Design a protein around this ligand. Structure first.
Ligand SMILES: CCOc1nc(C(=O)NCc2cc(OC)ccc2OC)ccc1C#N
Lengths: 10, 358
């Protein structure tokens, strides 16, 4: 369980 | 060429140290325009807010000051960092315009609230938001205005709290100016003039996390008073223990409303709206829903606190002592909760602040 690094703010 | 300059910012004019280029607006609000800029000297982009009528009322003063102060005295990786603060005027006589500069992320939480995330993202985002607040609370500071407009995310999936112009401590009053926080997120103790604790923020936190799942404002409200009716219709009329705490005037009205039992959180929030449950326990709809039902609670004295939010099975699988229980910030002692001054007197402190803060 590791922290996300991406976030498609589109 | 006096080492500043102005730019025709949409409706009004701006004035910044040349270093800031290509000033395009992004923030139009109740505290003034806030446009993005590319700080040359920095080699990174930034955001600049220009305080709208900082001395208009003895209150704006009290807020502009706290704004500054608090922007300065408090730091965390989940709180927009204060890059700078400057003024173009030369002396206190001239002085009346203040521009604050701070780091800038990629978007608004309203941007997230319009896309479907997954337990990984949603839980992490809430975690960060929760750590940011814990920092403020650790210093007896309350934000009083957490909402999407005041929360920013960046492409690397990290978020940071915003604005402090309404941030303060204490809770003596019942909020002589409760009209200021944004309706759809006002917490019961605010709506019903009551005197708030630190946990008055976890309400807004629920209203938001609920917004990210539902995708629509949790408790609408066509007006300051209708707000309340939207809260009870959802969560049901509060119990008599609670009522007994309202001012005599409020208690009566609050008791003459129709009685609603409300609906179960499984109903308010069916599974299907939450991300896809995997097979793992900690990150399940059950948990996310459970945390919600502990934030969206009328009786503050029965409503969760950050301490526990950060410890909850849904947000807790990211827990890290540093971020979680960082060092409580420390304001000098200027910041308080009442201290009133003149329009000038206030202006005085602001300058001698904008100064050693330039
Ligand atoms: C809400 C605007 O105010 C502020 N916003 C930010 C911020 O990072 N906003 C994210 C953001 C970035 C954009 O790309 C250029 C465009 C629109 C945005 O959403 C508005 C940071 C500080 C303040 C302040 N003060």
């Amino acid at each position: 369980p590791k922290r996300p690094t991406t976030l498609n703010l589109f | 060429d006096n080492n500043f300059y102005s730019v025709e910012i949409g409706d009004s004019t701006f004035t910044v140290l040349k270093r800031y280029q290509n000033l395009k607006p992004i923030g139009s609000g109740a505290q003034g325009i806030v446009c993005a800029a590319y700080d040359a000297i920095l080699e990174r982009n930034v955001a600049i807010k220009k305080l709208s009528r900082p001395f208009q009322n003895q209150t704006h003063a009290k807020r502009a000051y706290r704004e500054l102060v608090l922007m300065k005295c408090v730091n965390h990786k989940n709180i927009i960092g204060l890059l700078n603060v400057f003024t173009p005027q030369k002396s206190l006589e001239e002085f009346q315009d203040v521009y604050i500069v701070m780091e800038l992320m990629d978007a608004n939480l309203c941007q997230v609230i319009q896309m479907e995330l997954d337990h990984e993202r949603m839980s992490y985002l809430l975690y960060q938001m929760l750590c940011g607040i814990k920092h403020l609370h650790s210093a007896g500071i309350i934000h009083r205005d957490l909402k999407p407009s005041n929360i920013v995310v960046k492409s690397d999936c990290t978020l940071k709290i915003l604005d402090f112009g309404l941030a303060r401590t204490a809770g003596t009053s019942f909020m002589m100016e409760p009209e200021v926080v944004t309706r759809y997120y006002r917490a019961p103790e605010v709506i019903l003039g009551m005197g708030y604790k630190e946990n008055v923020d976890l309400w807004s936190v629920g209203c938001i996390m609920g917004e990210m799942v539902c995708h629509k404002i949790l408790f609408p409200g066509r007006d300051y008073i209708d707000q309340w009716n939207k809260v009870i219709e959802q969560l049901g009329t509060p119990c008599p223990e609670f009522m007994k705490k309202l001012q005599p005037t409020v208690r009566t009205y609050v008791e003459n409303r129709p009685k609603y039992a409300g609906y179960s959180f499984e109903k308010l929030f069916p599974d299907v709206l939450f991300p896809a449950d995997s097979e793992h326990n900690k990150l399940k709809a059950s948990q996310a829903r459970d945390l919600l039902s502990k934030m969206l609670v009328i009786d503050a004295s029965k409503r969760i606190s950050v301490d526990e939010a950060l410890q909850h099975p849904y947000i807790n699988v990211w827990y890290d002592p540093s971020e979680a229980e960082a060092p409580p910030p420390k304001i000098p002692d200027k910041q308080l909760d009442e201290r009133e001054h003149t329009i000038e007197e206030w202006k005085e402190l602001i300058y001698k602040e904008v100064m050693d803060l330039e």
